[PDB]
Each structure stands twice: as structure tokens, then as C-alpha cells.
Amino acid sequence: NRPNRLIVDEAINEDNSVVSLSQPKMDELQLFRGDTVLLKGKKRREAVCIVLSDDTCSDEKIRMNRVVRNNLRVRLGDVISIQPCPDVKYGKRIHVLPIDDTVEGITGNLFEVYLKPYFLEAYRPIRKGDIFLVRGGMRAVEFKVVETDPSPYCIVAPDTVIHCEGEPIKREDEEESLNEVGYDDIGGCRKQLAQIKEMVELPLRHPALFKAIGVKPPRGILLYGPPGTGKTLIARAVANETGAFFFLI
Amino acid sequence: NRPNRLIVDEAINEDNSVVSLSQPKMDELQLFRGDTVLLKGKKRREAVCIVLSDDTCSDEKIRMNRVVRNNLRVRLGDVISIQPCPDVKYGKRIHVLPIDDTVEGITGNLFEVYLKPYFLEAYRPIRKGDIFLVRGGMRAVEFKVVETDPSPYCIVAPDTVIHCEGEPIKREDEEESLNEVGYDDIGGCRKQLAQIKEMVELPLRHPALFKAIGVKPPRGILLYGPPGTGKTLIARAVANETGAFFFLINGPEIMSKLAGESESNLRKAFEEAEKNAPAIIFIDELDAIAPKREKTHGEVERRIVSQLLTLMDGLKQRAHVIVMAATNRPNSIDPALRRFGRFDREVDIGIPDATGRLEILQIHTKNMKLADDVDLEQVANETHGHVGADLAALCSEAALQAIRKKMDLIDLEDETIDAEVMNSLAVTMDDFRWALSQSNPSALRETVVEVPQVTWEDIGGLEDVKRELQELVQYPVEHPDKFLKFGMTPSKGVLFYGPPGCGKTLLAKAIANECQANFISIKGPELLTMWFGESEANVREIFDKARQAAPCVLFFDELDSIAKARGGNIGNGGGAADRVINQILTEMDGMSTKKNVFIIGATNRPDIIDPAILRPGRLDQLIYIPLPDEKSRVAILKANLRKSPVAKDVDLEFLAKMTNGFSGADLTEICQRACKLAIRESIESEIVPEIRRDHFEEAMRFARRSVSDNDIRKYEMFAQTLQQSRGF
Ligand SMILES: Nc1ncnc2c1ncn2[C@@H]1O[C@H](COP(=O)(O)OP(=O)(O)OP(O)(O)=S)[C@@H](O)[C@H]1O
Ligand SMILES: Nc1ncnc2c1ncn2[C@@H]1O[C@H](COP(=O)(O)OP(=O)(O)OP(O)(O)=S)[C@@H](O)[C@H]1O
Ligand SMILES: Nc1ncnc2c1ncn2[C@@H]1O[C@H](COP(=O)(O)OP(=O)(O)OP(O)(O)=S)[C@@H](O)[C@H]1O
Ligand SMILES: [Mg+2]
Ligand SMILES: [Mg+2]
Ligand SMILES: [Mg+2]
């Protein structure tokens, strides 16, 4: 029913917005390797991305980067709506702005160090109000386009121009700070993260269904291990990657 | 007088209202197999049911389902009035309604999922204002007919119509919520439940009679056992299945209070219990509030313990108050509590066995819908260290695994999911296998007290020792009259000695099985590792646990490891008979003969066994198990090859005559090696399912003898002269 609902989990490509699909998926949606795709999420907001042809991932799962999960306000295990738009779209002027939470203490023309070796030879799309992060200078800055030609009608092309401002925009509470810890910030514990997810995500993401079904939830998870192994990191990541109120003791 | 009063106890048919009677009962009331019967209870209310013809239940007892006990407001052990009405009665319109305590979170037409495969092909009667429960959708709903043709004049028939409402009726306080725990919610503890009933029901159900008769009631029941064994469940069930006011005291909750406020809580608890009729005080986690006063820090804790002792002592028979307590560390309880007048009755809620844990699995999966491949008996067999809590967790994890495969395949993203798809969700045997794969048994370290599964058929040969073991174990417990007639006291002990791998463990387990007696196996390394903590009380606890398990066989396996702690009788020159073995002798001497506990020792080092074991009265039946002879080898091979698809060309007696000094373990190794060669052949051929003559030839090619000729000679020497041993 409605073959357009896609299940979301963490991606494997450690880059900017490049979604990954499964073997039946690119055939069902007749999408090619280097295709420009449009992702539709909750709260009436959109994201435009590039598909990646993967086969040995699972039967039905899309892989979503944490950079663009916040652009769609969708969390792990959530359902996403997708729409292929195989039309080449070039932007003329993108009015782009940083955020004054990650740009403090850095001056000068940050574009020649961040946006130059991040745009060229990539051909990635940009939508209105997209928070994309570029790493460089031994630090990471998330970045915000605020004004451009009508959305999205933009992919990275050499005819797209850039302009320095130096006036970062304040971050509102509608979006989650990407600087916070996520599942991508833990390495070496994937089996343990898998167990934690299996125990935690279903009771929290689907509380009404779980309560109606009348089965015992695991409510006593106890993380243990040698000091400095990421226990606090794992707990805070699970707190952040779910829409659960987190009280720390 | 008045041959119409019927005594009520819990039923055996795990279904809706189907009453069960005894052999004199269907003849006395001239009622047939499939008869419609009308049950009359207290408070002027009625129930209509179907009789079940049973004979091997008891002399006079009716069996009542908990679904219809609440319809009659009658509890366990109560007297019921019955009236056969063998008239076929068909209802036209039954106005039926759910209750808004068990239907929350479920929408849609619940009749097509609940009442459809519950009515048809059953032909069960329905009365006015009957609360019947239907299980389905991984949950249970009790249900209420509120309007229909005159009562009852209704049985389940195809001409009875149904109608959806979606307006559940509120539950009044006149009836008890069936969702609460009852005796049907405990599995694996029937003997303990029987003892608890015998101790509790008479003082509570008949307080005036008990007070007038002037006899001491058991007022100090103390439940104990490993964590998660149902102690709290049992206490709450006994509270619910009797009309007793139930006041609960939580150990941590009491101890979390400020100084001087927890004492007030205990005093108020006892005062309320004394005030409110016959009552039960349940102190859950008693070790939290009452540890040993010698080992405790604060004086507030000591005041708490003293206050509890004072309240226990000030509890009079006139109060009609029964105090139950649960603790998973009974030895950490202050000894003053476990004395007479405070806590004198002790019930051990032990780890469930295979049958008991199968019953627990059924109790926890009755709401769940299982696929046809689900073998709960197999799951019970594959779970060993699990307790009731472990099994409940396993069932919950299997259900959640089933959901995980259905929440993605079917978009259950709806806020309040209906039951029209919940039934489509079924739990497969693969889900249970996955749940069992990821499960940590809590009671793995606990000692096992159960009837072992191995029979005589698993033992080849050894017919003479089988007969001797029968005479030593079965006869005293089966025919005490002969023993008292001839005046001989049965020997309480047997020592098995002989070459290794000849079936000493199997013999003890099999003689346990034939008597249907409990079996406790204590291996030598287990003793040597419990004793390294210098815990002299654990070996005493072993004999204690054997005492409540009577008739039981206490088997000490691998006594050679014990006797090799310091080398043996000489060893380093000092005696290896130390540590546990002296306490074992003391415990053997300190157990009464009239107890049905039988002690069996096994060792393959008769040279270094200390003589004090062999003294008459401790282990004086010296049974020597030799290497199997040619025919016993055939029997052993046949026993070991029962579970394997052996080809017809395999000549078992040829193998028996080609193996001379081999023990039963050696023949088992030969069979295992041949089976492994067959497995290798199958694996290679995949890139036939019958173990063949060639496989056995190849296995025999590398077959090895685990007992030397010198060892055989020395064992034969000890087989003749081991009674001497002691003395020099
Ligand atoms: N598995 C990991 N992956 C990535 N970073 C890690 C990992 N484990 C530790 N770190 C880093 O090391 C820091 C150590 O903090 P934590 O490991 O979260 O503290 P902890 O694990 O609770 O150990 P304690 O508190 O000393 S017992 C983290 O904040 C991370 O920056
Ligand atoms: N014998 C049993 N039959 C059926 N269900 C059981 C049994 N034992 C445990 N359970 C289930 O497992 C749960 C564990 O709770 P309890 O066993 O009552 O706690 P407990 O026995 O007092 O052990 P503690 O409190 O940890 S020392 C129960 O609520 C039942 O759901
Ligand atoms: N008479 C027998 N019939 C069938 N199998 C036997 C027999 N004797 C030994 N076996 C096999 O050998 C294994 C060991 O048997 P046990 O009863 O443990 O003998 P044992 O005298 O205790 O010597 P060990 O130290 O245990 S090998 C059993 O599990 C069987 O597989
Ligand atoms: Mg930490
Ligand atoms: Mg408890
Ligand atoms: Mg053995």
C-alpha cells in the first residue's frame, strides 16, 4: 500500500547529502546512479539530494545522513516520503549565511577554505533553508542558505556564484544543533548500539502503540565497561537520536 | 445430608466455563458428558455451564474455572450449589458489551477477531450478567452481556446473532477484575502452592471456626528462592484467591523513609491488618529491612529489626492476621525472625523444572497468537537456567521480535492500532529461537532439584546393579511394610566405584528417574570451589535442600577430585580427607533414617577414597561397576545409537567383539566419531543421511582404549578388597 513510504536509518557514506537505497528500490522508482532526488519529510519541509546505488544493504531501507535528517526534522527509524525529479536545475545567486554558534573565533573569508573545496567537482543540490555542514580548519561549521532563486532549482555548478558576508544568522530552536552527539559519533560499538536501538527505539518512538499492545518494555538498561569507552557518549547519543526527553543524573 | 453441596477448587481445563466432576458425581446427579448445567452461588446469582466427565481427580471435588468463579462470587475451597437443567435453550438476541478497563487502545470490530473463533463449534451457554473473557490480539478482554432474552435460555448456536457497539461499560466494584493474578497465573510451583493453601486457606476462610477450635495457626510463612521465581506473584495470588485484606510492605520503600517514620509505617501496617478482618501482611524483600543485627551499621536499622520482632511477637491468634514475607537471600535474614512465633513456616520457591517452565511458557503465551511451528515444549527443554521472570522476558522478546517484522512490512504507523491486524501478527518458532539466542539465564549457578530424564533404556547392560539399586531405593519407599515386618532398617547409602566411563553417573540418574524421585548432583569440583570461600554453610544447605526434596537422591559425583585435594589417604603424607568431606560425613550421620533421602557416591579412584566414607551407616553398599562385557557393549552401542539413523548393514556385535577393553564412554566416542565422519561426508557431498558400516570401520580404525590392562587389574583387585580398606 502506497509504495512511496521509505524507512530511515543511519547512512554509511561519510559525506554530505547522498542517500543510499536497496536493490528493489532504484528499480521500483526507476532512478539511476547519479540522479537528483527530492525528499519529503514531516512538518511540510523538503530536501533535495543525490541517490547512491547500493544493493547489499537490506531488503527495504533507505540510508539518510544526519546532515539532512535535521533538514527534514526526521529521526532514526522514521518513515520518509520521496519523489524523483530527474531535471537538471542550476542556481544563479545563492545568498548563503553562517550560524553564530559554530563560527565564533574564526575570521576572514571562510569560503575560500570551506566552500571552495566542497562545491567543485561534486554537483550536489541545494534547497531553501538547508543546514549543511562543512568540515575544515580542525573544526566543523554547519551553514545556511537563506535566499536564492526559487526552491530548489539549484545544484552545484561552476556558474553558481558566491559572496562573503561575515554576518552569521542566529539559530532558532526549531532545528537541532548538529554539533550534538549522534550515532555517527560513536565508533567501535555497533553491536552494542544495535542492541541499545532494539531495546530503546520502539518503546520511545511508538509509545501509544507499545502501550496498547500490552507487552513489557526493557526499562532497566545498564551500560558498563572500562572507563572512557563511550558510555556517557552512547547514552547522550541515544537521547539525541530519539525525540525523548533526557534527564541526566 | 443435602446431597447438593459441592466443594470448589481450581480447574484443570484451560478454557472457558467447563466444570469438571468426579466419578460418583455424574452418577449421583445423573448427568451425561455434554450436558448443560446450572450453577448456583452466594449473593443470589447464578451461572450456567457445561459439565466435563472426569474420574481420576478426587473422591468429591468439583473443578471451577476462574472465569466463572467471579460470576458466582465464590472463592477457592468454598461450597457451591448445583442444579442440572438438561434442556436445550437457544437465544435470539444477546446485547453484549465490553468493559473499559481491558479494551483501551484497541479499535475496530473486535467481534470478528474475538467472538467469532470463540463461539462457533463450541455450544456454550450464556447467562445474564456473565463476565467471560476471550484471549486474542496478544491480550485478554473480559466481556459482559447486559441484555438478552430471559435468563439464561441461551447457548452458543449459529442462529444467535451479534452486533457491534464500541461502547464499553464501566466496571463496578461488586466483581473482581479477572486481570488480577490468580492461582492459574503461577506455573511450576504446585507443591509449594499446595503447602501455602494448606497453611493459609483454613485460618482465613474460616476464622470464627478456627478461633473457636483453639489451635495454633501458621502465622509466619516465609517465601524464599532465587530472584524472579514468583514469590511476589504467589503472595499476591494467595491474597486475591482468598477474601483476605492484603497490606503490602516493601523493604526498600520502608527503608527509604526517614528515621522514626518507617517504624510508624510498620506500626500502621500491623494496626490496619489487625483492624481489617482476617488479613495478610506481605513484607516483600524482607532482607532489606531485617538483615543480621550483628552485621549492620545504623541504630535506626536495628530499631527497625527490633520493631519488626516486637510486632511479630505481639501478633495474637485473635488477630487472625497472617504475615508472609519474601526474600531471595534467606541466609541474610536475621536469625531471630526465623524462630518459632515469628517465621516458622518456610517455603522454598525453587527454580522451575522442564515441565514447570513449559507451564510458565504456556501461561505467558496464552494471550499471544503462536504459529503452528511453535513448540513450547522444545523451548522449555532448551531453557535450563531460566526462572519465571526469565521465561516472561523471553516471551516478551519473542513477541517484540515478531512485531519488529510486522511494523515495517505492515505500516503500523497509526496512533491506536486496531485488532483486525493484531491477529494477523503471529509469533513464529523462529522468533522464539531468536529470543532464546539473546537471553541470560539468571539461575545458571543454582543447584537443580528435579527428576532426571535418563531412563534404564539409556544404560546398556548392568542389569545386576540395576536390580540391586531397585532393591536399595525403590523397595524401602514403595514397600515399608516388608521392612518393618522383618525389622531391618534400609541402608541410606551407596558408593559406586570402578573404571571411568562405565556409567556411574547414568546409574544414579536412572535410579532417580525410576523412583520418580528428585535428583541432586553435587560434583567434586563444585564442592572444592564452594569451599574455597570457606563457606561451611553451603554444604549444609545441600543436605537441607535434599531434605525438603524427599524422596530425593543426593548424588556426589567425581569423589576422586575431592580425594585428590591433598593426594589421597597418604598423598603428601597428610590426609586429603579434609574440608568438605568431614562435613559431608557429619551431615550423613545427622540425617534421620525415616527420611527418604538416599545418598549415592561415585568415584573412579577407590584407592584414595578415605575409609570414613565406607563406615556402615554412611555409604556401606559398595557397588562395583566393571567394564562392559561383549553383550553389554552391544547394549551400550544400541542405547547410544537410538537417536542416530544407523544403516542396516552395521553389525553392532561385530563392533562389540572388536572392542575389548573399551568402556561405555569409549563406545560413545566411537559412535560420535563415526557420526562426525558421516557429517563430514554430508558436508562434502553438499558441495547419504545414514551413518554406514564404512563410517564405523573408519572410526574403529582410530578407536582408543581409555583403561589400561594394569588399571583393569587394579580395579579388579579393589573390586574384591575395598571393604577392608579401613583399618590400616
Ligand atoms: N566509542 C567511542 N567513539 C567515539 N568517541 C569515543 C568513544 N569512547 C570514548 N570516546 C571519546 O572519549 C570521551 C570519553 O567520554 P566517555 O567515554 O563518554 O566517558 P565514559 O565512557 O562514561 O567513561 P567514564 O565516565 O570515565 S566511566 C567521549 O566524550 C568521546 O569524545
Ligand atoms: N512461577 C511463575 N509462574 C508464572 N509467572 C512467573 C513465575 N515466576 C515469575 N513469573 C513472572 O515473572 C515476574 C517476576 O516477578 P516475581 O517473580 O513475582 O518477583 P520475585 O519472585 O519476588 O523475585 P524478586 O522480587 O526479584 S527476589 C512475575 O511478575 C511473573 O510475571
Ligand atoms: N552403560 C552405559 N550405557 C550407555 N552409555 C554409557 C554407559 N556407560 C557410559 N556411557 C557413556 O559414557 C558417558 C559417561 O558416563 P558416566 O555415567 O558419566 O560414567 P562415569 O562412571 O561417571 O565416568 P565418567 O567420569 O563420568 S566419563 C555417558 O554420558 C554415556 O554417553
Ligand atoms: Mg561518563
Ligand atoms: Mg518480588
Ligand atoms: Mg559421570
Side-chain angles (χ1 to χ4, degrees), chain A residues 79 198 208-209 211-212 215-216, chain B residues 104-105 396 404 412-413 415:
Chain A
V79 58
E198 293 170 352
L209 186 163
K211 189 258 191 179
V215 67
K216 290 275 269 189
Chain B
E104 53 89 15
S396 170
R404 264 188 277 286
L412 293 174
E413 306 161 352
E415 180 74 19

Side-chain angles (χ1 to χ4, degrees), chain B residues 289-304:
Chain B
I289 65 167
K292 286 181 172 172
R293 281 176 300 181
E294 57 88 19
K295 190 260 295 178
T296 188
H297 195 86
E299 291 305 310
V300 185
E301 290 184 341
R302 293 176 180 178
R303 287 182 199 163
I304 287 294

Side-chain angles (χ1 to χ4, degrees), chain A residues 185-187 227-233:
Chain A
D185 281 334
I186 297 89
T229 45
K231 295 179 293 293
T232 306
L233 192 78

